Each structure stands twice: as C-alpha cells, then as structure tokens.
Amino acid sequence: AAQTNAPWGLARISSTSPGTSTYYYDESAGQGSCVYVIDTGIEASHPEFEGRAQMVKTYYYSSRDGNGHGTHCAGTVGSRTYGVAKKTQLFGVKVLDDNGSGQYSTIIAGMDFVASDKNNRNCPKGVVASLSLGGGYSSSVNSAAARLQSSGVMVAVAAGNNNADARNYSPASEPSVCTVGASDRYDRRSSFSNYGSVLDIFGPGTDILSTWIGGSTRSISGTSMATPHVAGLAAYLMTLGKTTAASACRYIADTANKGDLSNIPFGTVNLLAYNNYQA
Template identity: 55%
Template sequence: MQRTLLASAMCAALGLAVQSASAADLRLAQQPVPGRYIVVLKEDSARLASEASIANRRHIPEVAQVAQQIAAQSPGRRMRVLQSFNEALRGFVANNLSDDDIVRLLEDPRVDYVEEDGVVRINTTQNNATWGLDRIDQASLPLNGTYVYDTTASNVHAYIIDTGIRASHNDFGGRVSGGYSAINDGNGTHDCQGHGTHVAGTVGSATYGVAKGVRLYPVRVLGCDGSGTNSGVIAGIDWVRTNHSAPAVANMSLGGGASSAVDSAVANLSSAGVTVVVAAGNDSSSACNYSPARAPSAITVGSTTSSDSRSSFSNYGSCLDIFAPGSSILSTSNGSNSATATLSGTSMASPHVAGAAALYLAGNPSASPSQVTNALINAAVSNAVGNPGSGSPNRLLQTGADGGTNPPDPDPDPDPPGDEPCTACAKYSGSLSYSGDYDYQPDGNYYYSSGGTQRGWLRGPSNADFDLELHRWSWWGWTKVAQGISSNSSEDVTYNGSSGYYMWRVVSYSGSGNYDFYLSIP
C-alpha cells in the first residue's frame, strides 16, 4: 500500500477518535518494510483472550489468540499474521494489509497502536588500528600498553543481538552456546556478515574482550547484508526475555529510525533483569531520533577516538549515557577460526560497555539493570571527551577501580644506598613454594589508605620469577590496579589513587624461595 494512503488511514482513525477516546494511532517508520506492520495490543486485551482460550480448553498463546481473531475479520481474509510476541511486548507482525484493514485496526479497542515495520542496520565503518581495551582501564592518556582486570566474568551470560557469531572461532574457547535466529536463510545463528563476531569479540573473546570468560549467545536478527527489520529485532528480544539465564547483559549494536515498538521491547527486556546496552548510531546527529538508541531503559553508548575525542560519525545528545572507544577497534572476525578485523562505529563502542557491565555483574550477580547503569556511570571519567556534542553527558567508560591517575614508571627513582630499596617504609617477609603459589601482604591482610601514592618493592631469589600486584577494593570486588611483571624477582610498583582499601599480592610465576616486601603508604 502506498504511504500516502497511510495518511488517509490516520485521518480516518483520528476522525473516529473524536467518538472514541481509545482509538489507536498509526506510527510511521523512517525506512518502512513495504506492506508489513507491527500491531501492539493493550495489556487487558491479551489477558482476556488468554482467559477465553483457557476456558475453551484451546490453550492458544494469548497474543496469538487475538491475532487470529483480528486476521479472521479481515475483508477477504488477506491479512497474514507472521509472528506474535508475548514477552518483549504484547503484539504481532502482519502483512498484506489493505487500507480497510489498517483503519479497522486503528478502530479496534484491543489495539494500542500500529507501527510500520522498519529497516534496521549495523552501525560500523571500516578502518584500522587497535587500542580500546588499553584505554578503558585507566583514567587518562597516554596509554600504558596494558589492560588490567580482576575477573573474567565467567558466571555472566551475554546475548549478542546482531548478525550471529562464528562460534568456532578460537578466541571464544567454546563459550558460545545455543542462541536464536530471526533470519530464515538457512544459516541459523552463524555469522555470514562478520559484524556480530566482531562485537562478540569485544564483549568477551580471550584476546580482544573486556570480559574474557563470559558466556556468549548469538541472537541473529540481521542478515548477511547487515540489515534486518524492527519485527526481527523484537523477535530476538522476545527470545532473550523468555530464555535468558541470569546474570545477563544484552548488546544491540544496531539501529534504525525511531520505533515505539522496539523501545517497548527493550524496556520489557530490562524489566526482566537483563542489562541492555545499545549503540548510539553513526549519523553524527541526535541519538534521540533513533531506536533503540533513544530507549530510556538502555545504556546508550557514543564512540571516541584514541585521542579521547568524540568520533566524527558518533551520534550525541541527551539520550546518550556514556562514551567508549569505537574508532579503529581490532577484534575477532568471521573469515576463519583465527580471523581478525579492525572496524569503527558506535557498534564497536557499545560492546566495550556491555563487557564492563558483565564485569560488574560478575561480582554483583543480583544487581538490577538500573544498578549496573548507575555503577558504570559513577565509575566513568568525567570531562575527558573532546567535543562530546550538544547535550551529551561527558562521561568516558572506566573499568579501573577508582579513576585515579595512570600507573607511572614502575621505578621513578633509584633505590637508596645499601640493601634496602626504600627508607621510612615497612618490611614484610614471606616464602613461595612452587610456581603459581602466592601470598597477600601486608601479613596476609588489606589496609585502608588515604589518597596518594602507594609504593611496593619486592625482592626475591635470583633463580626465580616472582611478580608483584596491587589490588584495590571497588564496586565489583578486588580489582588489580597496578603490577610489576618483569622476568626476575625484583619488582617496584607505584600507584597514585584515591582513598580506599588496598592489598598487595606476591605471585610466583616460576620457581620458589624466600622474599622481602617493602611497603610505603601515604
């Protein structure tokens, strides 16, 4: 049906609305799928249909019952119900609608609104280089060449709503399970495009992932050309809401025009306890014009470059929650079981935040989506993003413990004369018996310190390789914030941070023997 007729249908419905305050409205898509509509029902309509179905002992799912009734009343019975949703929202997808069908739907007291099904696409552009993981564990530039983390989030489930995942990729280590496909092309959940595998790699691959042990689930809603429909996205959300295991995070590195149906589905997924992270979009305009970027219940992510400027393509505005690295991100790809690719886009920024959400959930498995959101926002670095865009919150993702300064040179000044590496410091001694053995210092305990410089010196046997780590208590548990990992047993570590609880860990990478540990606190 031509879209000009939609306006006529809307006018007809508005005319009827004068007589009926409950008349539904018709919502247009920015890029519609011809002849296909998402019909969203009022909650009471679905419930009453379910009760009637049970009374008649037919046990038809509640929304499908209403959809069948509505389709049966179609003039000439041309309307076809393609799919119904019970969880993401109460509604169904239909095609072959005539003008009369649309007007009749808008008049139907069981219908909340009717929305054109719209096209959604991935949010990626091609480029090269790699740096994202290095950036998110420290508060400011320059990069220090390391990514420090204290959990792999192996107890967390991540649902990648995208183009699928190449499950056999070596970097996933067999952690890709099950999943769902809304695309009926014979590929199942396999990624024939590459985007979903790249996104999943940033969330949780062993080499390129933020949460390196997370369980990954492909939810394929975009085809081999990287595009799909709003109804397909809703079908994927519906599956996640019904089948997810907790604690859970869902990443949606996709987007299209504004869609009330998609926004409602995201809200219902969040209300089921799944933290939803979405890409802001690559149009260099307000994210509030796109779905799911504008969904209030999601964490909406803009993209930054390696110099902490907003990426030129990144959307911005009041619908954003946070920025994360998104330009020139290296991750897994679908070309082979060892393939990689470097991509740019808010699609690449979003999974950094999804991975960070998984890290938080690892230590706080009962946290609600709003608690996860608040934790990430509170830990973010303020005022670090250059040219964030009008109305944007200037917050940059931070997975480190406190947003303190970078770990400086591990040995900023030489040891004082004599055998002791420091003056006015406390000395503790211990022994490690085998490779992998470890001790906590001071004396197996932690301590509270005011803000300032924490310094530790390790002196161990010359025929062994002992390492020294500093951990700080944060909102997701003990987090490694600095370390010395040279090839011998002499390590000097310095860390500038805020007040809090700290603990040192001495680890045998290889060998055994006695050691001395020296500690200086502010």
C-alpha cells in the same frame, strides 16, 4: 591481571588517561555472567572464544554469521585477546541477515526471545544484552528494548553513526536502557558518533581490533564497537558484585572518567566507561 600490548580500547577502559597499552582487570573476568549478542550471528568455532560461545536462535535459513559484524562485536565482549570480559558466556541471536540488515519485527522478536530464554540458562552473576544495531525512530522497537530491560537484563544499545541527535533513532532513544556513544584513541568523540541528552555513556569505537569470520581478525569503527565494550564491562562488574542488571548503567556512569572527552556538544554527557581496577 594484566594484558600487555592490548587493543587500545581495552587499555583505555582500565586507565584514567589516554595513551596506555596495558589492560588491567580482575582475574574473575566475568565468569558466571552471560551476554546475549543480538546481531548477524557469532562464529562460535573461532579459537578466540575458547568454546564459550553458542548460537541459540536464528531468524533466517542458517545460524551462521555470513557477515562478520556479530562475530566482531562478540569478540569485544568476551574473546580471549580482544574482549573485556574474558571468561563470560556468549549467546548469539541472529536477527540481522548476512548483509547486516533486518526488519523491525524480527529485531523485536529477538528481544522478546532473550527475555524468555534467559530463564533456561545458568547465569548466576546476571545477564546482559548487547544491541549494535538501529534505525529510524519506532515506538514499538523502543518498547521491546524497555521490556527486555524490565525483565532483568542489562540492555546496552548503540547510539548510531549519523553525527546527529540520537533522539531520532531506535532503540537508541529509549530512556530506560544504556545508550552508548563512540570515542577515539585521542579522547575525541568519534566523528560519526550520535550525541544528545539520551546518551548514557561513551566507549571506545574508532579503529577497534576484534575477531572476524573465517577465524580471522579485523579493525573496524562504529558505535557498534563501543556498545560491546560497555556490555562486557557490565558483565565484569556484575560478576564482581558491584552492581546489578537494573542499576549497571547508572553505576557505570557514576564511576566513569569524567570530562576527558573533547568535541562533546553542550547537553551531552562527558563520561567514558572505566573499570576502576586497583591491584
């Protein structure tokens, strides 16, 4: 299949070079996979989700996304127009309040929740969790991310927007998960993107168009935006049977565009997520 005049990030992950405008992908489109978006919530009623999104847990007074951040990230995973995996099932877990902030204890609870809840869902092609959040180093937060991964869920996490080594941030610094940095449409590392040896992979993160609350759309920037590109790609590849939750991050790194990025500091991988689609 081919989506013309696609958002640049979608085009980039289906091309060996920057500057293209068409998203090429297999029609299966992540059908049969499930992606948990652990964030401020999802506006499930947005027409772009086509009924494929549902809130399953909240740690606040309402399950509504009063912020927009979670709805944006979910859209990049699997909305019709703005998503990588256009037929995946989306589950929302609200661990962040409507100002976009959250306590580490609540974030940990949300991760443990997903590890259990997945056993109550029909996800024959596998399960992914997308975490576009983070803060200062915490061994407890890292441990929760490791548990989630160990339970059989592909965990993708944002590297952080500090233009610094991700080793001092959590859950970015947990080695066993998939830590995602951000790039822009000219194949430069995004100016805000964290780096370091713990990064696994880069994805599009600057000027990313996606869904927003109130049935709208918005372009915003961050490693928060790069992370769902990689989560969606994992769901897509698991549906095609090319990889599993345990090995998806490594598979994505092995099949990535190599050496295409600029302003990558020595010791950080030069790898950009790529779907290797051949018609």
